[PDB]
Structure formats: C-alpha cells, structure tokens
Design goal:
Four copies of one chain form a homotetramer. By secondary structure, chain A is of the alpha+beta class. Chain A contains six helices and 18 strands. The longest helix of chain A has 25 residues. Chains C, D: Keywords: Aminopeptidase, Hydrolase, Periplasm, Protease, Signal.
C-alpha cells in the first residue's frame, strides 16, 4: 500500500530509486511469513505470527565477507556473529532477523543451508551465522516451534534485489512498535561528497517504543490520533529494534562502527527513549570493501575519517534513512489479531494524512 | 531573563524547581568567563573568549568519590579521567569543562588546587582530574594562554548550588552551536516510579550541529528564522550570503556504575531529537554520576538502595528523564546565549528570541 | 586419577577443597559426552566426538539471575547472552559450553527445557540462553547433527556439585590444546582479603595454543617432550617429524561484586593464559565470563548485595585478581593432564600430554 | 652495558638489529631525565626523580597521522588522545610518557611546541596531544612542579633514531617495577609472515608488579634473589625481612594494518605481561597503544595503505601477534636490567635487579 511519503510525511535528503536497502547494489532480501491459527495460545500449538527476514549483503551465491561494524543502543537482546564483527571487522554469510524464540532454529538452519550450498572446502567460513531477534510475545506463540527449517531455507533461497516488502512480514510479522503494529521498514539515501555519490540503505525490524513518545516528522502524534489502542478479546488494553545499514562507500570496519552509532540519532528523532528491556542494535556493512575467502581484502578506494565533507554526508544519510525506515514500517503494517485474540492496530492512515496535511500545507 | 519555556517552547516531563543540574541536591557549579580584546587574532595576545565551568558532584569540600559511567557519541575530543570511570566506576574531585587549548592548564591547576585544599594524606586520590573540552576556535585565541591558574581556582572556589548561569559563560563562552551562538545550558526532570521520585539533572557545553538540521520541539527551525547568519569580517559567512558537545548528567538515584553507563547512553537520543547527526570532527560525549552512591575515600561504598536493571518502571522513568532533560538543556543553551563578536571580528548571533517566540506561537497555539 | 599437582607440577596459592569451580558453593556442573564411530568423516554420519557442558550458577532449580561481567581476548567465536551481560550486568539460566556446530541446537534446547521446568509466568526471563563454543573440527563431524536435545537435557538435569570430571568430556570431548588433547579443566583458589576469605573457581574448555609455546610452571615444555605429536593412520601430522611414522573461561566467585567489578575479574584471565605461553591465534575465540553467586538478582525483585567492595581496596581486589590468574593457569594444566589420547574423525589421532614425561621433567626442574 | 640477553636470559624469536622500538624505521625516541635533591620530601621542593619520554612515530618533522589502536589491561591511569584513537583510528603528533603529576604541563607544552614548529594552517591538527603516565610517588615529589616546559621541548627536539637508552631515564626515571627499580625498556621482533618480514617494536614504561610474582624466562625469581629489597635509611622496607637492616606499552610496526587490526595487536600485550607473572593490580594503570608506520594519513589527504592484510590470514597475523607477545616480555626484562639502584624522596632506596645474581640463576637454569 502507500508508504510514508504517500501519506504526506516529509523527510530530508534524497532517497534512492527504490527507497530501500536494495538501492545498495547486490544486496538481496527475503522473507518467510508464518501466520496461522486464531484464539487462545497454547504453547506448542500457536497461534503463530512470526517469521524470518534474510539479508544477503553480496547476494545469495557469494562466499565472500563484507567489512562491518556494530553499535548497541541497549543490549537486552541477541545478535549472533557480533563478537566476530568486533574482532575482525567482517562477517560471512547472510543476516537473519527473527523472533526471539526462533534464534536457535535459525542459527542451525543457516549452517544446514551452507552444507547444501557451499563447497566443503569453504565450510570453515560458515561457522558463525548472524542471527538477531525481537520479541513477538503478545501476538505469537514464542516457544511453540512455529518456524521450521523449511521456512528458513525458503527465505534464504527466495531473497532478491528490487522492492522490499514492508510491514507484517518475515521477522517483523508479530511485532509491535509505539503501541501500534510493528514490523519491517526500509529506506535509503543517495549522498553527495563533492562529485562522488554513495548510497546508504537501512532496514529495520521494529518492536520498540511507546505511543506517547512517538514523533513523525517532529510531530508528537500519539495524542493527536484518536483510538487505535490495543485490545484483548474486545477490551481496550492501553491508553527491541534491529537496524541494518548497507552502504557502497568503501569504509573500513572502524568507520562502519561510526556509521552504526549514527542510527541512535535517527531513532532519537522519532521520540523513543530506549526501554530497559528493549534490545536496540545497529549493524553496518560495506558492499565495496569485500573480503574474498582466504584472499586479500578488496578496498577500491579509501576515505579519511577526518574528511568531514564525505563522512558527514554518509552519517546524515544513516540518520535520515533510519528515521524514514521507522515511519515506513508503521505505515506498511496493518492491523492484526493474533494469539489470545490480542489485537494491535496499524497507525491509521486517514488520521496520519490529515495531521500531516495540517502541519505541512 | 527568559529561558526556553518562557519563549513558548513546549517540552515533555516535569522539571525540577531550578530546572537545572543543581536540582540534584549538593551539586555545585561555578564559571569563570574570560572576555577580553577585540579585532585581529594574534596567537598569544587574543582576543580571548573562553573560560572554564566546574561541577562539584558532592560540593567543593567533599573528598569522596561518586559512582559514574560514560558514553561516547563521537570521540574526536578530550575528556580526562574517563579510563578511571570505565575501570572502577567512580571519579574523585570535580568535573571541569573548558576550551580545547586550556586542557593541560586546567588539569595541572586542579592538582595545584588539591595540594592547597586536601590533606596531604589524601593527595593520592587527586591524581586523575576530570577535564573535558570543546573547541572555541572562531571566537577565541585557542593557543594563546588566555586562561590562567587563578581563573581555574576562582571557578573551583566560587562554585555554588542554586540557579545556574547559562549562555556565554565559563567553558561555553566562545562556543558555536547549530551555527548560532553556543554555550552552557541546563535542565532537570523529576521522575516517578511508584511512590519513589528521583531527579535527573543535565548540563551541556554545546559547540555542535548545523542550522539546517536544528529542531526545537520537533520544528525544523533554521529555514524559518530570517537572518542571524554568522559574519566573518563584515560580510555574511554562512547560509546564502557574502553581501563538539559535552553532556553531564547527575542523579540522586542510587545507581551502580554499569547502570550509569546506560543513563549516559540515553543522551544521544535527546541529542537526536534536536536534529544533529554527530559531525566527524565533533567530540560528543556524556558522563553520568550518582550523588547517593558515594564512595568515601578508602572506605566502604555507600549504596543506600539498589535498583534492578530489568525493573522497567524505574529504569524507563530515569532514561526518559535523561532524554528530556538533554533535549531541553540544548534549547536552553541557545536561548541563553547572546550575540557575540570575538577574534578576527567574527560575529555569531544568538538565536533570535522574537522570531523563536513567534514560530512557537504559530506552531503551538 | 592424577591431576596436575599429582604429577609434580607446582602452582602458587591455596586451592579450595575440591580444586574446582564447585568450590564456589551452590554451583553445579554437568556433562554429556558423545563418542561414536571411527574412520572417514561424512557430514551427517560422523564420526562424532562432541558434547555439552552445563554450569548452573545457583543450581538447576534457580530462577534468579547472577551478577556477571565478561572479557574478550580474541572474539572469533560465539558466546550468546553476552549483550545482555554487557548491558544489565546479569544473566539468567545456565551456561552451556559446546562445539561450534551445536550452538543453535543447544540454544533452542535450553528454551525447551525452560518450558518444562519454569512457571509460565517466569518464561519471559528464559529468552536469552547463554551458549558458548569452541571448534572440534579435527576430531568431530561438526555439521553432522551429532548432538541431540536429549543430550542437552541430560546435562542440564544431571548437573551436580562436588568433584568435576575433566578431560575428554562434555563440550571438551573433541578439542585440541597446545597440539595435545584438549578438553575441560578446572581449579580454584581461596584468597585472603583481610579478615574475609573468598573463593574464586575457574572452569576452562580448551581448544587453543601451540605445543611450541606451551609453558607449564614456566617451563617451555614442548621440546622437552619426545614424540606424542598428532598423527593420521600412523603418519605424524605436525611438528619436526611430520610426514614420518579457541578457549572458554568461566569464573565463579562468592565475592559480592558488582557487574563492572566482575568485568575486571574476567580481564584477569588473559594474564593466566599468558603465563602458559599462548599468543591468541587470529582465529582462536578466547573469551572469559565471571559471575558472583552472592550478588544475586531475584526474578522481578530487588538485587541482593550482602556486602560491598571498593574497587580501590587493593588488598581485597588484588587477592581476587591473583586468584583468577592462578586458577586459570592451573585449570589449563589440569585440562591437559586429564585429557587422554583420542582417535576421531578422518583417523586423526591426538595424544594426551604424556604423564610419565611430564612427571620426569617436573621432578628435574622442581626437586 | 649488558641488556637481558647479555646476562644469559633466553628469549624466543628473532630481534631486530637494535632490539629496540627504533628497529621500526623512522621512529624517533627522546628522553629528558630530572634528578635533583635528596632526603625528606616537601611538596614543591623535591627531591625530584621524574622526566618525560617522547616517541615520534614518523619523526619529529611529520605533520601526518599514523593508524592506531589501543587496549586496556586495567584503566586506573591517564592516557590522552585515546578517545580520538578509538573513534578515527589515528593520532597526530608524538606520544609522551611521563609521571602522573606532569600530565597537564606536558599536554600544554606539546601544544606550545606545535605553535613553534607547525604552519598556522595545520595547527587545528595539534589540539589532541597524546600524553600517558605512571606514578613516581615513592621516589619523586609528584605534585611539586619538577618538570618544566623546557624539559619537554628538549625531549621533543632531541629525539632520534638508533639505540634507545633504557632504565632510569625520561618518564621511567622515578619508577618501581616488581619491587625492584622500574623505568624504560625496549625490544623488537622481526617476524616472518610468509614471504614478507615485518618488524614489531615495543617500548615500556614499567611501574608495576610485585617481586613475589616476577618470572624471568619462566623462572619465579623473587625468592632466588637474596637481599635487594627496598630500604629507608638502611632499614628494609618490604619483603620477609622488613624492619631489619602502572605500565605503559607502546607498540610500533611497519605492517600495513588497519585501526581495528592494531587494536588486536595492542590486546596481545597482556599475554606478554602475563608471561612475566604480574596480575594487574587494582590501582595499576596498565595500557597498550599500537601504531603502524606504513599506514599513514597525510594531513587532510587520502590515507596511504600500501598493502592490505586479511584478519583471517593466520600465518601473517599470528606472526605479528607472537612478535608483540615476545617483544613485550623481553622489553620488561630489559627494563629491569637497565635500571640501577636509586635513592630518592624520603630516603626511599630501591635496588636494580642484581646482575650477578640474575646471571648466576640463568646459568644454572639454562646451561
């Protein structure tokens, strides 16, 4: 359906052609979305509202590593492969984003996928899969084994470039953000440093924040929206965040850490305050600084960290793309009823468009 | 004079009585402001637009440490005593905030002050002074020895509780923020968890950001303000024509060091609200301390109550307090800082009060 | 059987009664050891030389957290739950130490175990299991699903206090250290901090280092031992005569330390590792995790900190730090002595450090 | 005079020609040594036993940065410029190593030196000087302004390549290590990374450790040496007969490493320190800084990275890491051997480790 710009939300900067992480060439994204059952939750039987999102930095047939660096806003969550990134500045294989109860199954399934897809001599490189989570506990049977190995293989094999589906898909299927429906969002910026252009792409799996704090384009919007509070069986019940950054800039690992640390500023623009139990994390990678398996790293150009013109263009790109990806998520996610007949509303489009038109005539 | 709220800027949460870092009882703040000379800069001769700000966590006569934790947004800058804070979760003595060229002088002056104020038996504890900087390079002769030991002593000895002066004072004297006049700002929040209340106080020394990114209460305001662009000479320096950040957080919550690191990491979200994107060469840092978790010199730490990190009600109240107080301290700074002409006749404008008030009235009727 | 001290190896300090991590009261350890098959490796069909080691910091029935802090020597490996430890300074549930290929299975199995053992209202707290690995790739079919959920449950349920089995057991089953057989080792120290004596216990899963660098009690011993280099089908595979016929450190203490203080403890492990000569290989995932059994966090309640220690109290802190260094040093040697010769996948044969030669060298050096 | 090898101490690996940090081409080192007064200490009036050591990574006329990374063993100390290193992976200007009381004076003096040596257009780059300390509190009047701006300028301007003076010089003048006289030590290794041989150079300012823990070439040597415990006016002040009659590590390499790779190098220092027995005291500020002299960043220009190394290339990386461990181990022993007995403030007398006894013990152990 509509994305945030289509409802009149303004943003700064110049988006890429897709306005998605796949504006960084060669990046592929895949989702498997598991939606089954209704009514009361029984552990092991559903209902299920869960899934997995796969990002292949260099595409699904690559055996090469990408340069990478991370940041932690609040570390109450899981993201595997990160000790590796901190130490050697690269990771091998895809990124998986999923629900908390699925981490182990996804991790082993990625290994199994490797056995089937990678030459035996290269299997040593496939030992530390990258798997991250947020908690779909209200809408999903977290502990009930709803995600299968076949679901994971389907996302790995089905991933592609081009437009990325947003909203209640893949790892975002069962999520809740700012008390509205959570999910997947994505955005990009094409940034200028003199005559050089680079792309910064961002994808988020959003399960964080309170309605009372939410800002969209600087507007504190929770109180301006009427209704759309969550429910349980019919009774109004009220009233973590994963960030993946891709760039084609040829950055070294410590420079990618800097990129990842900018995500918090974009999160801050939209009002949340990093809950004590909210696992909020960012991972950044370069698709031009690539490390062939067992060979010399390929760094086709080099950027000085004190070159403010280039670095600030890249940093502003991360902030803006993060800010927009978060709003794109909210708009893409539709109302859902899941486990225990819990109902969470998508942010209402008609009301958002009306508020945006009043604020930005 | 008016602060941000008085010009009609809305903020979330409940401020303390002074709406300042000194709402955390026992904290003292002092400034020495050095403004002398006009015209062309000659290194070693001025003009000078610099100073130093002192924060005594437990007051100027305390020999005790405070529990502490820090966070780095972008580390292109200096803040001494921080390896100590990372290792042992406490620091001794005051925090000094100053201009980049003054760091060594301030560091040695704090040691000299200790020799005169601390019993010789306790001097061992005074070896790692806490000194942080931002760069006053457009308005000040950075390398020219404008700050003296006497200026540092005056701020150390003159510090007090009560209202805190903001704007072009102390370490903020020569600073520039969002292309407007930079300086010192402060704010506080009184936060609740069940029947318990705590105060979170914030003081900033702001020298960061670009006009085009600035948000005040969510409003992207730089293009709505007419004029007030800097001048380099007699002609317009930025925008159309030619015709670092230090954050100190105090709380009376009885937090352990790793919990204060969490508090410090919330400052970035408050900075983010106001639109900047952490420049490559901008040293943006946060330090948080507790005034109830105190470590008597050579004795047993005093931790009068203890908080679970997974107690979201308590922790989120504290975190939200940091975010909101940081957001407001930054806007308070801009409002307090007046237009200044300094070295090389560079002129930087205070954000115009009349225009800001008008924009806020139109936006928040 | 003999441990390192019984072969004449001298160490500094005073061990606890068991000279093991279980000298810290209430800690329980369990192993499941999986050894099946011989000969050529086919992925999914073994041979298997693998397993899992479980450490319950407060015992298997506890729902409470322990204060914790970690350190990284070289981060090329996996240890889950560590973001949590860095952020909030505690973890819930047990520590699992296993082979690299088993991480996901163990992580999901720990969740399944919680579903069976923990009240539904407490399940929220069981979402970030702590699982760490070293790579058994020479002796084991890593990718071949040799470890099952039932193996994990058996270690979780079978864990106990008292003496801890060392050597080729649990997560250490298929490991190789200093080009000799690797595995599990443990040691403890009781350390005098003024009028109070604390216990520091250490358990290692050792899969690191080279024979040429190994020091035992300061003696560079690799060249003093004759033979015992690894083989394949009777042909020496490493060392001068070739061709011819990661490290996980777990520290427990009963000292009532805050999380940042436990990070300091964990950072001392590297010095104990250093004593024994290794240099942290580029691909060697070398990690330490320290926890307190007296600073405990009841689930959804107020942390219990029964006493408090000043970081600048060098008498207390240095006693604790020296304990970590000495217990780590000895745990590493205890591992080598406990681990016996093994032939595993692809007919790789790795020798236990020879007891007779070690004892002879120690007697000559330390009469 | 004899260095450690000349007294019979064995070490592993191959030193560079000078066995010093200046085996990395282009590095310059200078010292200013301040020794005045005897007897009772009065703050502001000595006695003084202090100084400053300067390391210019690319020589004293360079305006360029070097790639760099750091590590902390125990952070109770000061080292400026390190937030910069962590953030952007480089630093500008020289490294100064000094006593704790001198940090501020040295920091401002380095800025003043820049005003006099650097074009005004480049001054922006000189605002984050790198200054580190250890505490000379037993032998020196720390707070008494013994070090002057002129002393700092003399070390900055006098620095040179070639042999590096060790012992009671520069920043090490008033230091104490392993209950013997502390000071400056240096060593290097040339390491074979396939077909390329890189140099790793290490300089230490040692003020850490206890005699009871000291190991030299693995030998626990404190109880083997007779006498030489510190004194005050002829009465022994420490050890069993008492009453009767921080660490800075600087690593240079010519390997073209990226900043995160240099952090890995710096983290290896701890293993070299561990070999020699210390346990990182609670108040001991123990720090390492590593830089590359081939990966250089011209001021306001494009970084120069003449070749690039894969972190997972264990052959190359392990050669470099082993170089750091071995050079750090040897630098520490070289310091002890270079430092002579000194009596300083408050009549504190600290002995250089005795050469005759050390040589005798080494001969017995390594015949």
């Amino acid at each position: 359906g509509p994305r945030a710009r289509d409802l009149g939300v303004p943003f700064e900067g110049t988006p890429g052609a897709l306005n998605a992480i796949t504006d960084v060439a060669g990046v592929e994204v895949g989702h498997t979305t598991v939606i089954s059952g209704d009514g009361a939750m029984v552990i092991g039987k559903g209902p299920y509202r869960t899934g997995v999102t796969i990002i292949h930095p260099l595409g699904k047939t690559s055996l090469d590593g990408v340069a990478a660096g991370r940041a932690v806003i609040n570390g109450t969550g899981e993201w595997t492969g990160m000790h590796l990134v901190d130490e050697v500045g690269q990771f091998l294989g895809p990124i998986a984003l999923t629900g908390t109860g699925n981490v182990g199954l996804v991790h082993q399934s990625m290994m199994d996928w490797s056995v089937g897809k990678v030459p035996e001599e290269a299997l040593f490189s496939r030992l530390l899969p990258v798997v991250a989570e947020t908690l779909d506990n209200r809408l999903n049977d977290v502990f009930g084994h709803g995600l299968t190995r076949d679901h994971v293989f389907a996302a790995l094999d089905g991933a592609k470039g081009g437009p990325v589906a947003e909203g209640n898909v893949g790892g975002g299927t069962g999520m809740i953000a700012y008390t509205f429906k959570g999910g997947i969002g994505t955005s990009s910026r094409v940034v200028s440093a003199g005559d050089t252009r680079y792309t910064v792409g961002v994808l988020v799996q959003a399960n964080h924040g309170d309605r009372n704090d939410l800002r969209i384009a600087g507007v504190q919007i929770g109180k301006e929206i009427k209704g759309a509070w969550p429910e349980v069986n019919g009774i109004v019940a009220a009233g973590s965040l994963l960030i993946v950054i891709a760039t084609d800039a040829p950055l070294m690992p410590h420079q990618l850490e800097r990129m990842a640390r900018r995500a918090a500023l974009g999160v801050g623009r939209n009002g949340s305050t990093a809950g004590a139990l909210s696992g909020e994390f960012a991972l950044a990678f370069s698709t031009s600084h690539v490390i062939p398996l067992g060979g010399k790293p390929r760094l086709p150009a080099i950027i000085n960290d004190t070159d403010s013109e280039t670095m600030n263009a890249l940093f502003r790109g991360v902030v803006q793309a993060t800010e927009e990806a978060l709003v794109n998520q909210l708009v893409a996610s539709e109302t859902m009823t899941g486990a225990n007949n819990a109902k969470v509303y998508g942010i209402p489009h008609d009301q958002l468009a009306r508020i945006m038109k009043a604020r930005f005539p």
